[PDB]
């Protein structure tokens, strides 16, 4: 299967949350939801086997307290000043099972070779970039990823 690409604008593959409970879905729908509970940021519900499952939690300033990621059997818990992999604290950079977690001067990046990139920045913004193979197969606060903003979300 040969798939061509020429347009470099790929805003449809990016979902993020920032500021005062501002959310942008993969389809471009920007809304505000001041929820402080534990919510599903994005998960692969379009297949019998789930490739990824990312959840985020907020605490009160709208700070991000916990990010839970299930990536092909790898459990990553990101908290302020702590990174846990399968319940064990790790030292960054940390590469395991096709998942690379690295901290920079402004962000914590988790890259999964199945095609996802998660960024937890220091201005309290969580940005997720997904491979185009996950289109029309996701659910959560980031939408169903089908290129249409309102329908199916």
Partner 1 sequence: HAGGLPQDWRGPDFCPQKCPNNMQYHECRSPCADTCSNQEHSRACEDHCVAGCFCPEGTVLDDIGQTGCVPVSKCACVYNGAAYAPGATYSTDCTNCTCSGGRWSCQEVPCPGTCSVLGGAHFSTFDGKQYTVHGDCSYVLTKPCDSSAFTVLAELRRCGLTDSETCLKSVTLSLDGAQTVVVIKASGEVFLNQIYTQLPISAANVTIFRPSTFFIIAQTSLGLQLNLQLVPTMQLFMQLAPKLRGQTCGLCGNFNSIQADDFRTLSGVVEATAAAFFNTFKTQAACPNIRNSFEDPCSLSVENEKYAQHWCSQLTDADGPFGRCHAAVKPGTYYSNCMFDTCNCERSEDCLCAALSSYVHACAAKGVQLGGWRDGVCTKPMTTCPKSMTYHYHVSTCQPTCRSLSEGDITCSVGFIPVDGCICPKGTFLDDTGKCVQASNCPCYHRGSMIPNGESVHDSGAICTCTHGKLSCIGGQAPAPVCAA
Partner 2 sequence: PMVFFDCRNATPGDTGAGCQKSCHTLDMTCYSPQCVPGCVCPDGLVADGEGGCITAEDCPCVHNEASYRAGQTIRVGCNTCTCDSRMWRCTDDPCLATCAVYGDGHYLTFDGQSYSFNGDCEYTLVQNHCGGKDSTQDSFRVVTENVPCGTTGTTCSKAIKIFLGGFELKLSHGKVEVIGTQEVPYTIRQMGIYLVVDTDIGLVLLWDKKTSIFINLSPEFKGRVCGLCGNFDDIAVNDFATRSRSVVGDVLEFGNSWKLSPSCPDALAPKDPCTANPFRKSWAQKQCSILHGPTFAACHAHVEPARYYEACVNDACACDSGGDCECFCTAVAAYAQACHEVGLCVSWRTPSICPLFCDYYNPEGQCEWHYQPCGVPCLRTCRNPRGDCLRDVRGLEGCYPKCPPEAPIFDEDKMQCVATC
Cβ of residue 95: shortest distance to partner 2, in angstroms?
A: 5
What residues contact residue 140 under an 8 Å CB cut-off, 6+ apart? Answer: 39, 40, 41, 42, 43, 54
* Residue 2 partner contact from partner 1, partner 2, none using kind-dependent CB cut-offs of 5 to 8 Å: partner 2
- Of 54, 51, 52, 60, which Cα lies nearest the Cα of 40? 54
The radius of gyration of the chain from alpha carbons, rounded to an integer in Å, stands at 15
* Residue 3 partner contact from partner 1, partner 2, none using kind-dependent CB cut-offs of 5 to 8 Å: partner 2
How many residues are given for the chain?
153
11 binds partner 1 (CB under 8 A): yes
Work out which of 100, 135, 139, 148 binds partner 2, going by CB under 8 A.
100
107 binds partner 1 (CB under 8 A): yes
65 binds partner 2 (CB under 8 A): no
Give CA separation, 125 vs 24, 66, 120, in Å. 11, 12, 6
Work out which of 95, 136, 147, 152 binds partner 2, going by CB under 8 A.
95
Using CB under 8 A, list all residues that contact partner 1: 7-11, 14, 104-107, 129
């Amino acid at each position: 299967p040969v798939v061509r690409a020429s347009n470099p604008a790929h805003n449809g593959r990016v979902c993020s949350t920032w500021g005062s409970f501002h959310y942008k879905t993969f389809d471009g729908d920007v809304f505000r939801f001041p929820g402080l509970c534990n919510y599903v940021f994005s998960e692969h519900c379009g297949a019998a086997y789930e490739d990824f499952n990312i959840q985020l939690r907020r605490s009160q300033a709208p700070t991000l307290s916990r990010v839970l990621m299930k990536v092909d059997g790898v459990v990553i818990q990101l908290t302020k000043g702590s990174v846990l992999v399968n319940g064990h604290p790790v030292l960054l950079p940390f590469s395991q099972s096709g998942v690379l977690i690295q901290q920079s001067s402004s962000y914590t990046k988790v890259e999964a070779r199945l095609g996802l990139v998660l960024m937890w920045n220091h201005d309290d913004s969580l940005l997720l970039e997904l491979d185009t193979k996950y289109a029309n197969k996701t659910c959560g606060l980031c939408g169903d990823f089908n290129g249409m903003p309102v329908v199916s979300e």
